[PDB]
Amino acid sequence: MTKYKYTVEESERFNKHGIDLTVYGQVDPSATVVRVSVERGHFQEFFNVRSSYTYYVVSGQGVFYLNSEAVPAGATDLITVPPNTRIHYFGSMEMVLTVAPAFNEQDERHVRFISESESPY
Numbered sequence: 358m359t360k361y362k363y364t365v366e367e368s369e370r371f372n373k374h375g376i377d378l379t380v381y382g383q384v385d386p387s388a389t390v391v392r393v394s395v396e397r398g399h400f401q402e403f404f405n406v407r408s409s410y411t412y413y414v415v416s417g418q419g420v421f422y423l424n425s426e427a428v429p430a431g432a433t434d435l436i437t438v439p440p441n442t443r444i445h446y447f448g449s450m451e452m453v454l455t456v457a458p459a460f461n462e463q464d465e466r467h468v469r470f471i472s473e474s475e476s477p478y
Contacts, residue, residue: 419448
């Protein structure tokens with residue numbers, strides 16, 4: 358009766374601010390895990406008042422801006438961002454993102470848009 362396995366074929370895909378997001382559709386209050394594909398950047402800065410965001414970089418290279426501080430990232434790195442931290446990033450990367458506890462739209466706060474020209478990728 359329990360559904361354990363979720364596939365890409367059955368997921369929802371969105372373009373969100375320059376990233377391609379794969380939302381599998383599982384429900385679990387403790388964490389939301391999604392796939393993020395980015396060609397040049399996430400051209401919007403936000404923060405989340407409740408959840409930490411942990412990015413695992415499967416492949417590629419980029420740079421996170423976390424409360425305006427540059428944090429370089431490469432394949433196999435783990436980027437762990439506490440709640441209430443401003444986030445944007447540039448890069449050409451494939452990532453797995455964990456939001457914990459579970460992502461809630463209401464918790465995410467817009468700070469500013471980022472010009473597409475600002476990405477060096």
